Amino acid sequence: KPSGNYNYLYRLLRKSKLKPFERDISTEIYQAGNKPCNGVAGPNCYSPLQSYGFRPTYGVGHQPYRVVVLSFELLHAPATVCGPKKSTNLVKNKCVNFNFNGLTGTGVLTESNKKFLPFQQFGRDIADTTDAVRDPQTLEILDITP
Amino acid sequence: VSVGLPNMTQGFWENSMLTDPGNVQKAVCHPTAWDLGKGDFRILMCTKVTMDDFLTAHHEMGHIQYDMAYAAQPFLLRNGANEGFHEAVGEIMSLSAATPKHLKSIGLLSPDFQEDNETEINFLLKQALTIVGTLPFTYMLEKWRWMVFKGEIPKDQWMKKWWEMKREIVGVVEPVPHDETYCDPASLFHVSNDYSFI
Amino acid sequence: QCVNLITRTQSYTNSFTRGVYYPDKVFRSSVLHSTQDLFLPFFSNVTWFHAIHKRFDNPALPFNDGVYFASTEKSNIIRGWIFGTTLDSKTQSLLIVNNATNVVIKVCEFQFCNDPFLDVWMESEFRVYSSANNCTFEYVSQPFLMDLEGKEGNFKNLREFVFKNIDGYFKIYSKHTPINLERDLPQGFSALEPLVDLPIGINITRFQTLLALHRSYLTPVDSSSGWTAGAAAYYVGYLQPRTFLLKYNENGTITDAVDCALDPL
C-alpha cells in the first residue's frame, strides 16, 4: 500500500518451538516473564504480533513477495492424482506394436465385426488370447490378429 | 567497483532527482544524502558541469555506501562508530577521485596530458591550504570551546585571552582590539547552534 | 433432532437362484469357463429381516465379505445407505443418498443418530440434518433407481444390489428386473451388471438403510402416533468363496450358471 500495508501480520514469538505445520491464530499477549501479563501491562505483557509495513518504496529484500509452497503425499492407498498422457493417432492394417491401454499388444488391426457390451473392454477366445479391443477415445471396436 | 564495492539498487537512480528542480517546485541545491531506513536511499542536488560536482558526487556515494554497509545492524546501530567517521570516510572517497590516472583510464582525461613535479607540488600546496590549513584552527577552536564548556576559565578574563593565543598558538593577530562583551570565537556558525569541533 | 428408536422385528425365508454377477471387464462368445471367487451360494439360507412398511424398525445388521441386498418397492421409499465401522463420528463411513435429483456419495465420519431418519415434505423440503461435518469427500451421479411411481394394475419390478469390499476398491453391482409374478423372488435366471467402483479403503462391519417418509405435514401438531414396529421387504444374504460355471451367448451375456458343490451331478 502506498501509505503502508499493515494488514500482513506475523507472530514474532511463540509459546514453544514450532511443530511442522503448526498454526497460531490467537491474539494472546505474550507474557515473556518476570511479571504476569494481567490484561494489558507495560513492561512484561509483550504482544508478539508485528506488521510488515509494505510500502512500494521498500527495498528488494523488503518488498512483498508471494510464495506458494506445495507438498505431496503418498500412502498405501489408490493413487488419486497423476499426470496426463497424450496419445498419438491410431493406424489400421499394419503389423505394429500398440499400447491401447495397460495391456501391451502387437499385430495387424482390422475393423469391427462383433458388437460388444458397454461395460466391456477385452475380447478373448477360448485359449486366453486377447483379440478384441475397444478404443479409449472413440467408441469403436477393433480386432487384432497376430 | 574498481575499488571492490558491489553495485546496488537500480530503482534508486530514478528515485533521486539530480538536475535543476526549477521553479515548478521549491527545492534546495545542497548535495545531501538520505538514508531513509529499510532499503531506501536518495541523493539531492542540482548537477552542473563542474569538477567539484564530481567531487561532491563521489562524496555522496561514499556516504551512502557507508550507510548501506551497516543496514544489517539494527536501527540504533545503523550509524558509524562516531560522528566524525562518516564525514572522514566521505572525504577520503571525495579526495581519492581526483587522481588523473583514473581519469585517463576512464577517459575523463586525455592521455596527452602529463603530470610533473611542480604541478604535483602545487596540488599538494592546495591540499595543505584545504586540509592542514584548517587543522590548527580547528585545534584552537576545540581547545577554547573545551575550556569554555568545562567551566574552568573565568568569563571576565576574556579581554584579550582568545586574541592572545590566536596570536601565539596559530600566528594570527587581530587588527582591532575588542572589549569583554565580544564573544567572536563563540560567534561562529557551529558554536551558535552547538555543533562541536572535535 | 432425533425420534423414537426402539422398534425391531424379524422374519426368515430362502433364496433360489439370484446372485450372479459378471467377473470383471472381459467378454467372450459361447465359451464355458470357470472362476473361483466370492459368490452367493445356490439355494442358500437368507435372512428376511423385515416384512412390510408406516412402521418403524431399528436393527443392528452386521456385514461380512460382501452382501446381497434385494427389495421390492414402488415410489422408492428407501433412500439412504450407510456403511462403516464405528458409525459414531470416529472413523470414515459411507453414505449414499438416492434422491430423485441426483445420487450423492460421501465417505467420512458422521455423528448421526443411532437410528437415523431423514424426512419429517411439500412447500419446503425436509433435508438431511443431525450430523457432524468434520470430514472431506465428494461424489455425485445420476440416481440409481428408475423413475418413481412405476406401478400398474399388476406387479412391475424388483431392485437388487450386491456390494463387495476388496483392496480399497469398493464395488457395487445392480439390476432392476421387471417381473410379473407377485410372490417374492421369481423363478428364473438373470445376471448382475457392474456400474460403480469407488477407491476408498475403509473397512466395513455394520450397515443399515434409511427411509425418507414424511411423518406429517405440520411439525408440532402431527408427527408419529401409533404406527411402529416394522419395515419393508429387503432380503439380505451373505457371500462365500466358491466356484461356478457360466454360459456365454453369441452377443455376450450370462444365461446359465451351475453350482460346483451342490450335488454329485
Add this chain to the structure above:
Amino acid sequence: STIEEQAKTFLDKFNHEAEDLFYQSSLASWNYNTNITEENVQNMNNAGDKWSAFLKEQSTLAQMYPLQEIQNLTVKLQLQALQQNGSSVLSEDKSKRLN
C-alpha cells in the same frame, strides 16, 4: 525468562517501530526537500514529535532493565544508548529556558 530475553524483545520491537517512524519522517523530509509544502512540514513535524515521544517512552521503559546484568557487548551497548538520561534531573522551566 531472564531479563536478557525481555531486553531482547524490547530492543527488537523498539527497533521495528522506531524504524517505521524514522522511515516515515525521512520520507516526508525527503519529498519536502524536493517539493516544499506546508502540509509536508506538518507531516514530518507530527512524525518527529511522535518519534521523540516514542524514544522517551522506550528509554523510560528500558530504565527498568539493569545495565549491569548484560554480558553480550551488543545488547549492553544498545541498552546503554537506550538508558541515556537526557532529562533525568531537569526542571521544565529550566528546559524551556534552555530551548
